[PDB]
Design a protein around this ligand. Sequence first.
Ligand SMILES: CCCCCCCCCCCC(=O)SCCNC(=O)CCNC(=O)[C@H](O)C(C)(C)COP(=O)(O)O
Ligand code: SF4
Ligand code: SF4
Ligand code: FES
Ligand SMILES: [Zn+2]
Lengths: 688, 112, 62, 185, 93, 119
Amino acid sequence: RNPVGGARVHFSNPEDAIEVFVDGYAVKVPKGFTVLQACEVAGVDIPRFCYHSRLSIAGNCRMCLVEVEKSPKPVASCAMPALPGMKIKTDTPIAKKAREGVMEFLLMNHPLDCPICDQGGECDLQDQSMAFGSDRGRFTEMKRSVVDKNLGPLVKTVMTRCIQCTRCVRFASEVAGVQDLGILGRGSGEEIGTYVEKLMTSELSGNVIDICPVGALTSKPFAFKARNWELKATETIDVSDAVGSNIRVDSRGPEVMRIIPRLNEDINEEWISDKTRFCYDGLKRQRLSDPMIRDSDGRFKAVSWRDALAVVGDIIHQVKPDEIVGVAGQLSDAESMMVLKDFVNRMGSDNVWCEGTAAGVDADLRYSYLMNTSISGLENADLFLLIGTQPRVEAAMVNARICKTVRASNAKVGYVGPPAEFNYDCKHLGTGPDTLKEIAEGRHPFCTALKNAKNPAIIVGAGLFNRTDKNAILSSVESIAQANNVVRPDWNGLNFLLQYAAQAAALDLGLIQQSAKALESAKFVYLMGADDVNVDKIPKDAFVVYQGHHGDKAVYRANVILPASAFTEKEGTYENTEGFTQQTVPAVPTVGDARDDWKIVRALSEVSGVKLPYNSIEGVRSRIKSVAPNLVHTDEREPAAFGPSLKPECKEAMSTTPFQTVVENFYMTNSITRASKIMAQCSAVLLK
Amino acid sequence: IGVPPNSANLTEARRRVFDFFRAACRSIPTIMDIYNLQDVVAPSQLRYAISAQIRNNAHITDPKVIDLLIFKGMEELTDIVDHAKQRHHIIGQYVVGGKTDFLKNFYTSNYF
Amino acid sequence: RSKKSPMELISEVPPIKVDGRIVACEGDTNPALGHPIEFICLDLNEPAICKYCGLRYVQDHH
Amino acid sequence: MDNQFIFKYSWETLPKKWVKKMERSEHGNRFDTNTDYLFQLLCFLKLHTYTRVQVLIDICGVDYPSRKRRFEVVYNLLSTRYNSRIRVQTSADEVTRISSVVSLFPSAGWWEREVWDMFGVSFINHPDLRRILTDYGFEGHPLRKDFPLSGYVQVRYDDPEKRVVSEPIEMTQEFRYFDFASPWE
Amino acid sequence: AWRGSISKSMKELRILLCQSSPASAPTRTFVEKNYKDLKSLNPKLPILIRECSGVQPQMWARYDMGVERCVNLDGLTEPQILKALENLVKSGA
Amino acid sequence: KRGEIGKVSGIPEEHLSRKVIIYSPARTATQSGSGKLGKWKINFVSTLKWENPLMGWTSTGDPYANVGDSALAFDSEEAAKSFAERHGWDYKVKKPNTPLLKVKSYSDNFKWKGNPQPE
Ligand SMILES: CCCCCCCCCCCC(=O)SCCNC(=O)CCNC(=O)[C@H](O)C(C)(C)COP(=O)(O)O
Ligand code: SF4
Ligand code: SF4
Ligand code: FES
Ligand SMILES: [Zn+2]
C-alpha cells in the first residue's frame, strides 16, 4: 500500500525506524512520528479539524481519536507519539462512537447557513459530517451567536461558523510572524479576534482563508461570486515575483474567479502572498485588446494588425542600427525574450535588456544572480546576512522560510540596509557600504557569529546591481564569503535574490545592457511590456512601440500599441531566483485581438524584412537550447557548476551612498496589480 | 456476407486491400447513375480519389489496423451505394483538390 | 412601486425591538414556509441584519 | 437453479481452460473467459441439460481506458427452465475481432451491431455488421470515454444549398461540468 | 595576442557544457584555467558559461549581425579547445 | 507516435494533432482530505471560449472542452501515456508534487529557551 496523498517519508537512517500496526499491517516509521502520521503512511486517512502539517500540534477538536490497546481512553492521534509495537485501531466501534460524538458536539452551535456560506461545496465540516458523522441531531435548544468583526479588505469574517480550532492563531503566531490574532475569552464564549480594531497587515494574511476548515474566514473580493464546483482548476505558476510560487487558477468561462495555492515543498510550501492571491482582478481591467496608432491630433485609433505591423516595419528601416533599443518586461517569458533578442540582433543592434536588474550585470557565470542555496535549503542555515535586501516585500516566501528557520533553529539574522520592518528578530548591523567594509576587516561583534556558524547564508538583493559601485560591493561580499567560509562543496551559502520573474531568464539568455547611455540616444524603442521604466528618459524624437497587455504610463508616450496576452493566457517558461524552470498553462482565452509576445515579435521580424528560422513555439525552444539549454530542461534541480574564484580581481572603491529600497509599494509592483481594484484598497488601508 | 476472420500477416492485408479497391472500382458505374454524376466527374477522377486514400493510409504495418480500415471503407462504400447519404456529401468528400503561412495565421487569430 | 428595488424596500422596514441579547429569525410566521433558523447576536450599536431575510434586529433596552 | 448450485456445477462440468474468473455473489454469478473460447462456452451453456440457458438478454460493452484490453463485452443470459441468470464477460481492445454468437442466439445480431456502432468492436462471422443507431456517415463511436458528449459535428439547414448540411459543432452555451467529488470519500 | 582582441571581432561567447559527465571534463578544465584570463583581457565581452545535464559541449559566437558559428567540443583536448576558440576569433571576424 | 488507433477511431484529423498535458491533479488548499488524488488526467488545453451576445452564456467551438475533466480519467501515468501514444496526441507529462512527512511532536511546542544570556 501507498501513503495517503503520495506522501514521501524520509528515513534519515534505517536503524531509527520503529514498527507499528495501523490496522494489523506492518508499518515502519521513524522515531518521532505521531499516530496520525503513522496512519497516513499506512494509507489510512484520519479525520482532522485542528491539525495542520505546517502548524504546531494542538489537540483541540478531538476528532482524530483512535483506539490503542494499552490505553483505557481514546488517544489524540495528532499528538500521541508512535511507540514500537503499538497496535492502532481506527475502524473500531470506540473510534466511531468518538467521531460521531465529536461531530455532534461540533454541529451543535453551528449556524444553519450552508446555502449562504462561501465554503458551501468545499467545507471540511460538512464533508466529514457526512462521512464520519451521525444522521440525526438531538439538539433543540437555542444556539449561541457572536458579532462579526472587520479584519481588513481581504478577509471576510463570519465568526458564528467558527469551530475554534485555533489554526488561524497558530498561523499568525508561527508562519505569518505578525501576532495580532488570538483566542479571547473562556469557555463556550471564547472568540477569535484582535480585541482592538486592527486589520491584518501581513503579506501572508490571505493564507488564513485556506487554513480555516470552515467558512468563518473567507475571501472578501471572492464573496458569493461562484461555487467551487463551477470552477475549472488550472495548475499554473506565479509571475508576480521571482519566487515562482505554484498556484491553481480557478476560472468560470473566459474570466478568472480566484487563485489559491498549490503544494510545492521546494518553492512556496502551501502558501502564497496577498499579491499573488488577489492579482486576478487586474487581468480584466484596462486590458489592451486592439492595435492602435496615434493620429495627427494625438489620439489612438483602433487599427488592424496588418497596418500596425506595416507602420512599425516601415519606421524600423529608417533608423540607424545602433539607434534601436529593445526593453523586455518583468512579466515576459523566456521565449519572447529570445525572439526579441534575435530580432534586435539581426537589425544590427545589441541593446536588449530587462526592466530591473539590467544595468550591466555580468551574467557570465550563473552563480552571481541565483539563490545558490535552494529556498528549501535555507532551512539548514544558522546565520542569515541580508545585504541590502528586504525579502518581506521583495520575495515574501523567502521571508516566510527565513522566519521558519529563525523560529525553529534559533538562527541569527543580521541586516545591512535602509530601515524597514521585519517579522523576525534582526540585528541592524548598518545601513550602507561602510558596514560591509566593517564586516570584512573584522572585530565587529557580528563577525564572531558569522565565523562561528556552521552554515552561514549571505543573501544579497537585486537592488545592489543598479549602483555605480556594483563590482566593488560584489567583491566585498565575495571576500566576506571566502574569508568566512560559506561556499564549500558540502554547503553553498552565497545567494543573490532577484525581484522580477523575467530577470533570471533574461540573464540566462544574455539580455544584458551594453551601454549605460543607450535609452537617451535611441530613435526606435520597442517596450516589450516594459512599463516599469521611466519613459521620461526616452527622447521626444524616438518612435516608441509598447507591446503589452495593460495600460500604464508607457502607453501615454507610445506611438504604436500592440496588444498582448497575460501569463494566464499563454505557455511560457519562467525561471526562479534559484534557477528552477517552470511553465505556465493557459487557463482563460485571450481578450480581444491580442497575440502572444513571441508571435508579435516574429511577425514584426517578417514584416521588417528579417527572416527568423523558427516559426512555431517549438522552434523557439530549439533556439533557446543553443543559448541557455537549461531553460528547456524544465522541472530539473541542476546545481551551479563553478564558484566565485573565477571572477577576475576588481579593485574598485565602494561608494558611500546608503542602500535604497527597491519596492516602495508592495501591492503596486507589476502592471497587473497596478490595474487591480483590490490592490488599491489594500495599499490604502493596509500599508502604513 | 460475414465479417472475415482477422488476418495473420501483411500479405493477407494487402490482398484484402486490393480486393476492396477492385470492389470499389466496380462500384463506380452504379454511383454515376444513382446520383446524377454523369456530367459532373470523369469515371477516373473518383478512382484516383480512392487510390489516394489508400496511398495516404499506406504507412500502416499492423494487419489488424489494416483490416479495420478496410472494414470501415467497405461500410462507407456500402452506405454510398445505397441512397443513405445526400448527393453533395460524396461531391464534398470525393473530389480531387503569398507572404508566409505563419503570418497569415497570425493575421487570422491567436489560436494556431 | 416597481421603481423601488428590493434593496430599497428592505432598507425601509424599521428594525425589530428585541429585549434579549439574542434573537432567532425564521423568516415567516409559519417556520416551515421561511428560511433556515438564524440566531443573531444583538451585542452591537448598529442594527443586526439577518443574512437570509435582510430584516434588522436591534436590542431594546441595553 | 440457484447461484450456490450453478456455481458449483459449472465449476466441475465446465472445461477448466475456458473460464479464468468466477465470481459468486448476490449481485450476479459471472464467468470471465478469453475471447477465443466465448462461442464454445455459450454453446455449451445453451445445450447442456442442467444449464439450459436458452435466452440471451442483451450484449453490452463497457469502456475502461486505463486497461490494456480497453473494452469489456458482457453477455447477460437467462435460463427459463431453471429460473436462473448467468453473466459471461470477455475483454477486447479496439483492433481485435471477437467471435459472434448469432449462430447460437438469433437475437444477438442487433445487439452486436449496436456494440460495434457504440464501441467499435467487430464480430467475426456476423451476417451484416453495420451501424444501427448513429446517423448515416457517422464518424466515431460515441459510447467511448474519449468521445465528447456533444460530438464533433452539428446539423443545420443551409438555405443557399437547399439541403440539411453538417457543420463543425459550436455551442451557444457549453456544457458546464460540475465537480462534486469529495476529498473525504 | 589573439586573446586581447576577442571583443573586437566577437560580440558574445557562449560555452555550453555539462557539469556531470566525462565528455565535458576537458571543457570544464578549459573554463577553469582560462575564463579569468579571457575575461580580464576582455572586460566587456559577455563570455556566457551555461551548463545543464544532457548538453553536448559547444562554443557559440554571435557576430556583427546575428551571425553565429558553433564548434562541437566533444572530442577535443584543452589546447584543442583553445585553438578552436582561436579559429572563431581570428577567422570569424 | 504510433497514432494508428487515432486513425481507426473516428476523431477528425484536425483534432488528432492537438498538444495535451498529462498530469495528476493535486489536493485543494481549502480541504485537508486526500481522496481525489492518485488519478491521472489528460489536459487538452481547451481555452477558446467566448461570451454569447444574447444572454452572456459561455460559448465554445471545441469538442474537447470538458472530456478530460468529465469522462477521461486514468489510474496511472503509464495508462495516460499509452492512451496519448495510441491516439497520436503530442503529450508532455507534469510529475505531481508530493508532500514530505517530517518529524513533528507535541512536545516541541514546549521547549526550553535556554539559560538567560545577557548578550
Ligand atoms: C465511392 C466509394 C466509397 C468507398 C471509397 C473508399 C473509402 C475508404 C478508402 C480506403 C480507406 C483505407 O485506408 S483502406 C486501405 C489501407 N490499408 C493500407 O494502406 C495497407 C498498407 N499499404 C501497403 O501495404 C502498400 O503501400 C500498398 C498500398 C498496399 C501497395 O504497396 P505495395 O503493394 O507495393 O507494397
Ligand atoms: S462552514 Fe461549512 S458547515 Fe458551516 S455553514 Fe459554511 S458550508 Fe455549512
Ligand atoms: S477562524 Fe477558522 S481557523 Fe480560526 S479558529 Fe475559527 S475555525 Fe479555526
Ligand atoms: S486533529 Fe487531533 S485533536 Fe484535532
Ligand atoms: Zn430571517
